[PDB]
């Protein structure tokens, strides 16, 4: 089937995966049809970007993901947004944005003087 997959990218230590929707007879880093999301596990809260509408489309036409992707879609609620069991419940931890460069250096200035 047209399985919704993760494909590897990057370098030897820190992988970064792209969420693709392609045929099962492809290879691990081969040709695709549509890159639709991604997933950066190497940091602990693990960035996840998922174009929801297009994933819903591909689940409608007759895709069939694998277990890890299904886990991600259930996290975000995309599977739950397709099946409506409780509702389309976002469990997604957007990462804690950090004190920016400007605020940092202004804090330095106002603290030191």
């Amino acid at each position: 089937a047209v399985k919704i997959k993760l494909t590897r990218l990057g370098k030897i230590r820190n992988p970064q995966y792209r969420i693709i929707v392609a045929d099962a007879r492809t290879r691990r880093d081969g040709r695709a049809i549509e890159v639709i999301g991604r997933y950066h596990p190497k940091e602990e809260p693990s960035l996840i970007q998922i174009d929801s509408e297009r994933a819903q489309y591909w689940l409608g036409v007759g895709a069939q993901p694998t277990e890890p992707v299904l886990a991600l879609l259930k996290i975000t609620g995309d599977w739950q947004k397709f099946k409506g069991l409780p509702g389309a419940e976002g469990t997604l931890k957007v990462k804690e944005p950090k004190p920016s460069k400007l605020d940092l250096f202004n804090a330095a200035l106002a603290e030191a003087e």
């Binding site: 460069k101 400007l102 940092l104 250096f105 330095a108 200035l109 030191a112 003087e113």
Partner: protein, 200 residues
């Protein structure tokens, strides 16, 4: 592979104060050796060579890494010579030298080499780190009991601090506010001949 030879050597060769306290330079500005008195041929090439020679020997970097910085400089949208110089001045060790915590350019290189700084929560034993705007350079913990550096922080009356630096730290905490620009730098030979050489 860091340089190792005498600072006096290149100094007597090309004839510039770069170290500052070089009484052998004052005593013998002529080049050294058996034909140290002898006369040299002039050209465009010799001048354009001597330019980068002086610059990169002042700052420690090597020819090829200077060429990498050059590739970035003419990759910029600005103009090659002066933006190369801004790139080249953006180094960590040169910033702290102009802050004046260190006696020699070798000494600033050595300080940053041995990991004696502590930048925004990470040890940085990187003698070529690039410092953009708004970089809070704190110094590490054990920095206190370095004896010649105690004397340094106490009576640092050597070459002044330029405009684009400052210290707002009782712990000798040096900070960037703007970047260097050539109108205010006023350092030896300008990089137009360098541009013409590397784009020969």
């Amino acid at each position: 592979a860091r340089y190792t030879g005498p600072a006096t050597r290149k100094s007597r060769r090309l004839g510039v104060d770069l170290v500052g306290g070089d009484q052998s330079f004052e005593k013998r500005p002529y080049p050294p050796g058996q034909h140290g008195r002898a006369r040299i041929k002039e050209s465009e090439y010799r001048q354009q060579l001597q330019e980068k020679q002086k610059a990169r020997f002042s700052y420690g970097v090597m020819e090829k890494q200077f060429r990498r910085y050059y590739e970035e400089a003419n990759r910029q949208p600005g103009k090659t010579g002066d933006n190369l110089l801004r790139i080249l001045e953006s180094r960590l060790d040169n910033v702290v030298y102009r802050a004046g915590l260190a006696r020699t350019r070798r000494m600033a290189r050595q300080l940053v080499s041995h990991g004696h700084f502590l930048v925004n929560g990470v040890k940085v034993d990187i003698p070529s780190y690039r410092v953009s705007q708004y970089d809070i350079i704190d110094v590490k913990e054990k920095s206190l009991n370095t004896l010649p550096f105690q004397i340094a922080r106490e009576t640092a009356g050597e070459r002044p601090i330029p405009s684009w630096l400052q210290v707002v730290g009782e712990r000798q905490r040096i900070l960037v506010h703007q970047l260097p620009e050539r109108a205010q730098i006023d350092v030896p030979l300008t990089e137009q001949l360098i541009v013409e050489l590397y784009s020969k």
